[PDB]
Design a binder for this molecule. Structure first.
Ligand SMILES: [Zn+2]
Ligand SMILES: [Zn+2]
Lengths: 179, 39, 171, 48, 128, 109, 45, 171
C-alpha cells in the first residue's frame, strides 16, 4: 500500500488544493482517524470540515466505519478514471474533420462551403462570388470555427496528453503490480 | 418528498444523473416487455 | 510490441500489443492509427522530417528499427535481380565478390547517390534480363513450390504416424 | 450555475441552487400540483 | 459514406442493370428518331443533347456486335456486374493499372487474366 | 556491419517464431526452409556463424565475455540448425509446467 | 477560515496545476454509478 | 454509373382534359416534368423508354383534380465516390482544372494534380503541362479522372476529382 501512498502524494500535489491537501495529508496514516481528532488537529471549521469530508466521501476516498467513532480509508478510483476521461476529451474535441476552407463573404459575413461558392464561382473573374452580393469570398475564419477551437485545443490537449500519459504509466506500474 | 426522492434500506436521496445512468443500460426487450416500446 | 510509443497519435503500442508499423521513403515510423490519422490530414506528409512522399509510399511490417525495415525492403527489391547463384559463376571468389557487390549496392542505395547505382542496375539488369534473371526467377519459383510440397509431405507423415499409433492402441 | 461549478464551488451552494433549477423547470410545465409554493410576478398572478 | 471504392450502393440498386457510353449513344438517336415522327411537339430539353453531344464525341466501342460480344465476353466470368461497366468505360492496357483503377480486384484472379481481357479489349477495339 | 545485420535478421526471425502460442514441433530442414523463405538467410552463411562470431569477438578486444553469453548461444544455435537433420528436432513451447501467470516461451533444439 | 482560526503548514513547492484541471473535474458525470471501471477497461482494449 | 432502373410517379390532371384521348394525354404530360429535370436522391434522369401501367384515378375531395399513379422504366445516371471517369476540361485556372462529365460539373484542385503538370497562365489558353511539354492539358481536353466526392443539388450534380492517381491524364 506504500506505492498507493506514493501515488497519493503525487495526486494531492497534482490535483487537490491546500484546504483539501492538508486534510488529505492526515489521511496518509491509515491506522486510526476519528472525526473529533481530525477536527481538533486541523482546527478547520466543523461545517467546513464536514464539507471536505463529504467531498472526500463523494470521491469514495474514505470508507467510514461505525466504531460513534469513525475511521477513514482510501476508495478513490478517479485517478485512473479521470485519466481515462482525459483520454476521452483528447480524442473528441482535439480532432478536426477537415480543412473546411469554405468561402466566406467579408461584407455580409455569410458562410459558404467550397461547394457553396463553386456554384457561385464566376467564370469571368476566375474567383468565387458571394450569393446575394457580388463581393468576393474569403477563408472560413471566424465562421464555423470548429478548427479555430480545435487548433488551440489540439496543442493544449497534446501538452496535457504527455503529462497525463506519464501519470498513466505510473498508475499502470502500480495497478499491474497489485495484479 | 416534494421535488426529491429518498431511499433507505443509509437513506440516500437520488440524483437525476444517477437514475439516468441506471436507465441508460436497460436492454431493448425487458424495457419492451414492461411496455415502453424502445423505438 | 513494447516500444517507446507511437509519435503522433500516441495510444496504440503502449496499450495494444496487436499492431505493426509502416515505414515511409525517409523511413522512420507510422502505425495504422498514424496511417489513417495522417491520410485524413495530408496523405503523404512524414510526421517529423517532412519528406516528399511520392505516391503516399507506406509499407507495413513488424520490426522495431527503421533502418532494419529499409534494408529488408531494399534488399528484397535488389535480390529480385542479381540472382546469379554459385551455379552461374565459374569460380567461388567471383560469387562471394558478387554478393559483396550486392551489399555495396544495397548500402549505396541506403545513403549514397542513387545515380551511378541506377546506371549499374541498368547495365546488369539489361545484360542479364536477356538470359539469366528470368531463368533464376523460374528456378526460385520451382524451389519455393518444392519446399512447400516437402513441408506438406512431412506433415502428412506426422499425421499418419499419430493416427497409426492410435489405431495400434485401439486394435 | 455554469460559472459557479466551472470554478469548483463549495458543493453546498450547488444543492440549494439545483433545487432552484428543479423548481423553476417544474414551474413552467405544471403549477397546480399540491405543495410546491406557487410563483407569481404581478398583483398576485400565479403562473399560467 | 457512400463510396463505390468500398462498394456501398443503395439497396435500390439490385435490379439496376447498367450500360456504357455506346448503348446510351444508340438510343439517343432513336429519341431523335422519335422527334422525327410524332409532330406537333415542342422543342427538346437541354440535358438531352448536352449528354448526347458529350458521349457521342467519345465512344468506347464501334458498333452493336462489338458490344453484343463483349457482354457475352464477360458472360461466363465470375463477376459482379458492376465490375464490367467500370472498365467498359476505362479502356486500360496494363493489369496493375486496372488494379490501380480498382481498389477491389487485387486478390481475385491472376493479374494477366484481366490483362488478357484487357488484351481481348485492345484486340477487338479498332484504333484509328 | 553486415554480420551484425545478419545476427539482427536471425534474432528477429527466431523471436517472431517464438511468438507462437501453441506447442510446435518441426524438423530442422523445415526451420531452415522457413528461414530461407521469410528472412533471406541461406544455409552455408548459417553454418559459418560460430566461426564468424568467435573471430569477431576476438577482434574487437572486448573483455568480459560473460556479458556476451546469450548471443554466442544464439550463434551456436544457428550452427546446429544449419548442420544436422533427420535425427534432431526443433520443439517450441510457449509455456512450461511451473510457470503460472508468466510468459516463458522456450525453444529446445 | 477568515476570522475563526488560520493554520501554518508545509505542502511543498512541487505542486502541478496542469491544464484545465477544474474543467476535467466538472466532467465526472458517472460519479458513484458502478461498472465505470469495466467501461474504462473496455475503452483501453 | 448509367443504370436502367424502374421507378414511379403521379400526375394531377385538370378536369378540362377528360373525355376521348384522356389516356395519351397522361403520356405527353409524363415525359415533360420527369425527364430532363434531374434530382438528387436517384441521380440523373436522362430519358424514359417504357411506361408499364397507369393506376386508377382517385378523385380527391374538392379541388377537382384526379390523381393517376403511373409506373415506368427510365435509364438513370448516378455517379459515385471513388469512381474513375473520362471527362472534358471546360476551364483552366490556377486553383485547378475544371472538367465536365455530361451535364455534371467537376472540379480538380491543383494539389490533386501531379506537380509535373505545372499550371501555365502564360499561354493564351490557360493550361497544365510538363516542363518538357510532353503533354499540355488545357480547355476542351479529354482526360481521365477519379471521383473523390460527389454532390447533388435541386437538379444539378457536381463531383470532385484528382489526377494524382495512376493511369490518369489525356484519353
Ligand atoms: Zn456577401
Ligand atoms: Zn499512431
Amino acid at each position: 500500500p506504500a506505492a498507493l501512498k506514493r501515488l497519493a502524494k503525487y495526486v494531492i500535489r497534482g490535483f487537490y488544493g491546500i484546504e483539501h491537501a492538508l486534510a488529505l495529508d492526515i489521511l496518509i496514516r491509515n491506522s486510526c482517524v476519528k472525526e473529533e481528532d481530525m477536527l481538533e488537529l486541523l482546527k478547520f471549521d466543523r461545517k467546513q470540515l464536514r464539507s471536505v469530508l463529504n467531498n472526500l466521501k463523494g470521491d469514495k476516498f474514505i470508507k467510514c466505519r461505525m466504531r460513534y467513532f469513525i475511521n477513514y480509508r482510501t476508495l478513490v478510483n478517479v485517478v485512473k478514471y479521470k485519466l481515462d476521461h482525459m483520454r476521452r476529451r483528447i480524442e473528441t474535441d482535439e480532432r478536426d474533420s477537415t480543412n473546411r476552407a469554405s468561402f466566406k463573404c467579408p461584407v455580409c459575413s455569410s458562410t459558404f462551403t467550397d461547394l457553396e461558392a463553386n456554384q457561385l464561382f464566376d467564370p469571368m473573374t476566375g474567383t468565387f462570388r458571394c450569393t446575394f452580393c457580388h463581393t468576393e469570398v474569403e477563408e472560413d475564419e471566424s465562421a464555423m470555427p470548429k478548427k479555430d477551437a480545435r487548433t488551440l485545443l489540439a496543442r493544449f490537449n497534446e501538452q496535457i496528453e504527455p503529462i497525463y500519459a506519464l501519470l498513466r504509466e505510473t498508475e499502470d506500474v502500480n495497478l499491474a503490480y497489485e495484479i | 418528498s416534494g421535488l426529491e426522492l429518498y431511499a433507505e434500506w443509509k437513506k440516500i436521496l437520488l440524483s437525476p444523473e444517477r437514475v439516468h445512468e441506471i436507465f441508460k443500460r436497460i436492454s431493448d426487450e425487458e424495457c419492451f416487455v414492461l411496455g415502453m416500446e424502445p423505438r | 510490441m513494447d516500444d517507446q510509443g507511437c509519435p503522433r497519435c500516441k495510444t496504440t503500442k503502449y496499450r495494444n500489443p496487436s499492431l505493426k508499423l509502416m515505414v515511409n521513403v525517409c523511413g522512420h515510423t507510422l502505425c495504422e492509427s498514424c496511417v489513417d490519422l495522417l491520410f485524413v490530414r495530408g496523405a503523404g506528409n512524414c510526421p517529423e522530417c517532412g519528406t516528399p512522399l511520392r505516391k503516399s509510399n507506406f509499407r507495413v511490417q513488424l520490426f522495431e528499427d527503421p533502418t532494419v525495415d529499409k534494408e529488408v525492403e531494399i534488399r528484397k527489391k535488389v535480390l529480385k535481380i542479381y540472382n546469379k547463384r554459385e551455379e552461374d559463376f565459374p569460380s567461388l571468389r567471383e560469387y562471394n565478390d558478387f554478393l559483396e557487390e550486392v551489399e555495396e549496392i544495397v548500402f549505396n542505395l541506403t545513403n549514397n547517390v542513387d545515380l551511378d547505382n541506377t546506371k549499374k542496375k541498368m547495365e546488369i539488369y539489361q545484360k542479364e534480363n536477356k538470359d539469366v534473371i528470368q531463368k533464376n526467377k523460374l528456378k526460385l519459383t520451382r524451389e519455393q513450390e518444392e519446399l512447400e510440397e516437402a513441408l506438406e509431405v512431412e506433415r502428412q507423415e506426422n499425421e499418419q504416424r499419430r493416427l497409426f499409433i492410435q489405431k495400434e492402441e485401439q486394435l | 450555475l455554469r460559472r459557479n461549478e466551472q470554478n469548483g464551488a463549495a458543493a453546498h451552494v450547488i444543492a440549494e441552487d439545483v433545487k432552484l433549477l428543479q423548481f423553476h423547470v417544474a414551474t413552467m410545465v405544471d403549477n397546480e400540483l399540491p405543495g410546491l409554493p406557487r410563483a407569481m410576478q404581478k398583483s398576485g398572478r400565479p403562473l399560467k | 459514406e457512400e463510396d463505390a471504392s468500398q462498394l456501398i450502393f443503395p439497396k435500390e440498386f439490385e435490379t439496376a442493370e447498367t450500360l456504357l457510353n455506346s448503348e446510351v449513344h444508340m438510343l439517343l438517336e432513336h429519341r431523335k428518331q422519335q422527334n422525327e415522327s410524332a409532330e406537333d411537339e415542342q422543342e427538346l430539353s437541354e440535358v438531352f443533347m448536352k449528354t448526347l453531344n458529350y458521349t457521342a464525341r467519345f465512344s468506347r466501342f464501334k458498333n452493336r456486335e462489338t458490344i453484343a460480344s463483349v457482354r457475352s465476353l464477360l458472360l461466363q466470368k465470375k463477376l459482379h456486374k458492376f465490375e464490367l461497366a467500370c472498365l467498359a468505360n476505362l479502356c486500360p492496357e496494363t493489369a496493375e493499372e486496372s488494379k490501380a483503377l480498382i481498389p477491389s480486384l487485387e486478390g481475385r484472379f491472376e493479374d494477366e487474366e484481366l490483362q488478357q481481357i484487357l488484351d481481348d479489349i485492345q484486340t477487338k477495339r479498332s484504333f484509328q | 556491419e553486415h554480420f551484425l545485420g545478419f545476427l539482427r535478421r536471425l534474432l528477429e526471425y527466431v523471436k517472431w517464431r517464438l511468438r507462437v502460442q501453441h506447442v510446435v514441433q518441426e524438423s530442422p530442414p523445415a526451420f531452415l526452409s522457413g528461414l530461407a523463405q521469410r528472412v533471406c538467410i541461406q544455409r552455408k552463411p548459417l553454418r559459418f556463424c560460430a566461426e564468424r562470431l568467435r573471430s569477431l569477438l576476438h577482434t574487437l578486444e572486448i573483455t568480459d565475455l560473460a556479458d556476451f553469453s546469450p548471443l554466442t548461444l544464439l550463434a551456436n544455435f544457428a550452427t546446429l540448425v544449419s548442420t544436422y537433420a533427420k535425427g534432431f528436432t526443433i520443439i517450441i513451447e510457449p509455456f512450461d509446467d511451473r510457470t503460472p501467470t508468466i510468459a516463458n516461451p522456450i525453444l529446445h533444439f | 477560515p477568515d476570522k475563526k482560526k488560520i493554520l501554518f503548514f508545509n505542502d511543498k513547492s512541487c505542486q502541478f496545476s496542469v491544464d484545465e484541471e477544474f474543467q476535467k473535474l466538472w466532467r465526472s458525470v458517472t460519479v458513484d454509478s458502478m461498472d465505470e471501471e469495466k467501461i474504462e477497461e473496455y475503452l483501453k482494449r | 454509373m448509367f443504370y436502367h432502373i424502374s421507378l414511379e410517379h403521379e400526375i394531377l390532371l385538370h378536369p378540362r382534359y377528360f373525355g376521348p384521348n384522356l389516356l395519351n394525354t397522361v403520356k405527353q404530360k409524363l415525359f415533360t416534368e420527369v425527364e430532363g429535370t434531374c434530382t438528387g436522391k436517384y441521380g440523373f434522369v436522362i430519358a424514359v423508354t417504357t411506361i408499364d401501367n397507369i393506376g386508377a384515378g382517385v378523385i380527391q375531395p374538392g379541388r377537382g383534380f384526379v390523381l393517376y399513379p403511373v409506373k415506368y422504366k427510365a435509364i438513370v445516371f448516378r455517379p459515385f465516390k471513388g469512381e474513375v471517369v473520362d471527362a472534358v476540361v471546360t476551364q483552366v485556372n490556377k486553383v485547378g482544372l475544371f472538367t465536365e462529365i455530361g451535364p455534371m460539373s467537376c472540379f480538380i484542385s491543383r494539389h490533386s494534380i501531379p506537380s509535373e503538370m505545372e499550371f501555365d497562365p502564360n499561354s493564351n489558353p490557360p493550361c497544365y503541362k510538363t516542363m518538357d511539354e510532353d503533354i499540355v492539358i488545357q480547355q476542351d481536353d479529354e482526360i481521365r479522372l477519379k471521383i473523390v466526392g460527389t454532390r447533388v443539388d435541386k437538379n444539378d450534380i457536381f463531383a470532385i476529382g484528382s489526377l494524382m492517381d495512376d493511369y490518369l491524364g489525356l484519353v
